[model samples]
Target: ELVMTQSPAILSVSPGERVSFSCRASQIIGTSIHWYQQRTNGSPRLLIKYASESISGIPSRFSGSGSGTDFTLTINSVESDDIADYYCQQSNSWPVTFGAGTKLELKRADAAPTVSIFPPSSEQLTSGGASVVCFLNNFYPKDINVKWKIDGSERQNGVLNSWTDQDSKDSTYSMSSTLTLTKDEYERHNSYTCEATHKTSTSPIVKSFNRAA
Candidate 1:
């Protein structure tokens, strides 16, 4: 039996950009590679065969290369239709096995979200335990990593929720994370930070607030 593993489980790419997928086999499989594209609400479509050959009716932008145990599938000048799940299949062994699959998604434009922090209001703030919200808007790609920190250490009590904008044509997204901390926790901490990582940003967007002594 042969095993196949794909690199970069997820890819965030933009229009007119290039992306490549790698598939490695457990043993030498020669030119037995086949690539498939599975888009949303559609069945898997054959894209390439024999590691470097094109299949009938497939787009010219889709190409494959490599040999032996290593193979690659490249998409030249990616388009919106290219957003889908890709898989590599090996047929050299008795039981055919496919890679775990890779998802190619579109990255939002080069823009960062507008972030704000909202601490609990009057009653909640004096109740000893209050919730602070890290709110983000105008972000893209929907997939983001939101992290909360207290006193420079990562905290796990952050509750995160996100949604896509229905009126935006660019697939813009937004999210909010609420972290509840007791009075003792917040009063003693010097810093509370929220970091958001998005596909379009080179670095994470950080917002920090300090509690009064």
Candidate 2:
């Protein structure tokens, strides 16, 4: 890449709120900025062209302004459905460079992962071990981590809960985590805890079951 671009890392706002994101080129590149919108599991679309032209399918509320190294993409009224990542590309010259991108999320988009856990169901429990499954649903801003803890144990183990369905709807995601433990571990432990941590939460959301109870 022979050029550079600038913008915020993640910008969020309320629905119907007007906002503008900018892309700046390192060198003078007149009227060459292209704005692209990329939604989850979707490729970058040519949303706007030549710094100020909106494509046929895009809404009129989405507009662009500016030229010559500094350009802006403005949204007249942000929609909850407008959640996506945006990029600005400089195609006027060779070695085209694209802005790192701005992740657009709604202010109320902080949908906490609904956390629930269950012990091994019938026919699935092996003799040597048992499995605990955590089902996560309706969560946003997907950096959620899930962990399991056995009561009285100082160590905590994390389950690989990193799967996000590209087909997730409404910009929300759902996933499942499976953790296994020896039969002795469950019988010996008084309780088992499942913890979920999200980007917006001050503390991890926890769900626990106590065998002693």
Candidate 3:
């Protein structure tokens, strides 16, 4: 049971669109929740008063449904004015706490990245140790982390990384992280793995690389 739970903090949507979101209560709260819309101007208005009750003068396009443990908000025929943060207030508790807020964005919301790996370069021992690279591509929000492992759950040493976000502006905003390792570091372990954690991905995306004899 949670005090309140909201999903997809960022909603990627646009014109001719209708949005739907949910607020789950820890326990059955009857009709004790409220839905609100906060505009970019900082002004907020109630869309659903007390659970599913409709507010006056709002518009037929806006509606709220569901009750108790599961509360839902339905905004049909998305309007230009509907782009903003949507939050819910819980009245079941004395403090009247509000949810963290879920937003409807005109462009893209947050995003997840893709993961892949490259084996060590060729050229014998003259190059010294083996070299491997891990590629994390097209990650948006440009925020991500990669965990490198070798030899049964051990951190790979002499690791280097770079993150590049090429002039982002939606269009599936692109970014990447590159990891490099030394020559010996590559041959010492037959298998290598990495994990990419992102907000859009509930479970991290992992990839493994191998060097053969």
Candidate 4:
């Protein structure tokens, strides 16, 4: 897994708010940076890489604009399709590395629009203030985006996390996020949501409160 970090570390972007994440190379290597998205509860998918080269069989709304330690991937119109996790990767290097993802949520300028999320069919976290982690999987080229949210609010920024394709392919990508908290906080919050987005689309897949029953 590659390690990466994000600025604002924590942010709230409205539906149309333009968001940017700064990705840095942990070492001097030949790998090129790539981007991906995983909507809540869905699979991870690529956005851009190798200096803005287009991946086959993806949407056009996603575009990578930047080079070196600075890169920007922008979605023209953030839609339900645009809500998800996002990440960057270095393909020019070995044991590919990725940046911790920036989650794009529906930021309502007027109201705190609630995005409904359901638990994944499988519940892994135990109830009552347990630590939790999330991953966006099955992305070709790259998959990255993982963080924690308690009671619909993002917790403190943790670390830069990334994962490589255990099996490479736009369809076989996997990525993750993690957080440690008390079991009481988890249960008392009532619910928490994990989201993933495919940059190619305008929306994302999501999961909410999958506490051990």
Candidate 5:
């Protein structure tokens, strides 16, 4: 996983603001960078990577350019599509991770919404374990939901919510939720899902348990 960083406070624009950030690898992972936006309780979707390689289905105005130890994430017009804390990650390595997000506030705190996320990290899951934590980084206001889903069924009993103040370019947002669950009836390495829902948005990001514990 890469340790990425963004500005503490980003001022929003009626038109939009141009910003850049850095995502550093711990040991020369040579991986591509990935980006995402976190609203209150929503799952994060990809933004940018490989310095400038744009992913399919992403907004064209939202573009990224950079490479080899340095990178930047840019929003073209800063529309509602622009008002969320943006995160950068490296696809070059397993256990993909992200940088703490940059909060996008209107230059006047009234024009646009405050965009942010916190405790930048990748999702972690294990099989046949007594407990497991789903670490979600680059999420802000700490407004998200992480539940255990085994074989497409929701496990209502295993969920947790704890708040911690984390760092960023502008200010701090809530720490990602760390939900712990005991061993279940399913076999080891079975498929389970972690779903996060935010406050302002309708879409939820879902990640599958693809790795071995």
Candidate 6:
């Protein structure tokens, strides 16, 4: 198996700037290196594949080069949303592994989101089905994840609403998720937890609520 390692550990830069991060493998693996962008609290997203090949959903400004034991992931005219953790994976081996990961961050400090949970009103709770909302605001980079759980079980009956600040140049974002529940479920007073993940947070931000009496 090949061991991959990323360099510089951290790269700090301003928006619209250019930067490149390197990934080296323990042994030559041809062009098997793939790049992934892992935002704070978000799952890793494919950025570049097969050394220099582009992948769907990745911006043109993001690219990869080099081959064999050395590879580089480059960002041209970096955007606020590009600030994240990057990792390299090798596919030449049977058991794939990832690099140590390199963090791309703004030269200045970034803010974490303010998370809150809104439970259904008393009247709505008695009406059979109710909606619970998880609200996240004032986060940066526009990349985040919101997960919902009911009584410790994962819940998928939720829709997420996310948007970036079109009026601001900094690219801050806001997001919310609403989960639906039945009257019987509400009556049980099962604990609902909303976990928000972002690059700025060291751990997932968790907010819990119970149906209003």
Give me the runs in candidate 1 sitting further than 4 Å from their true place.
8-19, 41-43, 50-57, 107-109, 120-131, 139-145, 150-153, 161-168, 171-174, 180-192, 196-213
TM-scores, all candidates, are 0.64, 0.65, 0.53, 0.46, 0.45, 0.52
What local lDDT score does residue 14 receive in model 5, on the 0 to 100 scale?
41
Report the C-alpha lDDT of model 2 over 100-187, residue by residue, as the tens digit: 9988865445688888989766455456777778888878876677777878353355344546653334667777887776676657
- Tell me which of candidates 1 and 2 scores higher on lDDT: 1
- Clashes found in each candidate (C-alpha, N, C closer than 3 A): 0, 0, 5, 36, 22, 2
After aligning candidate 3 to the native by TM-score, how far in Å is the CA of 2 from where it should be? 7.3
Q: Which candidate is the best by TM-score?
A: 2
**Tens-digit lDDT track for model 6 on 1-213?**
778989989787788998999999999999998999987679989999999998887889998999879999999999988878999999998899999999876664466888999887778877777788888887775578888888888877555565643224544567878887776776676688899889987989999975452
Candidate 1 minimal-lDDT segment of 10 residues: 159-168
Order of the predicted models by TM-score, top scorer first:
2, 1, 3, 6, 4, 5
Please provide, for model 1 over 1-213, each residue's C-alpha lDDT reduced to its tens digit, 9 standing for 90 to 100. Answer: 799999889888877998898999999999998999998789999899889998889989999999999899999999988988999999898899999999887665655688888766668867777677888887765667888888889988646565653223665667778898776666777888888888776788888877762
Native-to-model Cα distance after best TM-score fit, residue 143 in candidate 3, in Å: 5.4
Give the least accurate 10-residue stretch of model 6, judged by summed lDDT. 163-172
The candidate with the higher lDDT, 4 or 5, is 4
Candidate 5 lDDT score relative to the true structure = 0.56
lDDT of each: 0.83, 0.77, 0.72, 0.57, 0.56, 0.83
Cα lDDT of candidate 3 equals 0.72
Instruction: Please list the Cα RMSD from the true structure of every candidate, rounded to 1 decimal place.
Output: 4.8, 4.5, 7.9, 13.7, 16.1, 8.0
Enumerate residue pairs that collide in model 6. Answer: 40-198, 40-199
Q: List the residue pairs that clash in candidate 3.
A: 129-183, 129-184, 130-182, 130-183, 130-184
Which of the two candidates, 4 or 6, achieves a greater TM-score against the reference? 6
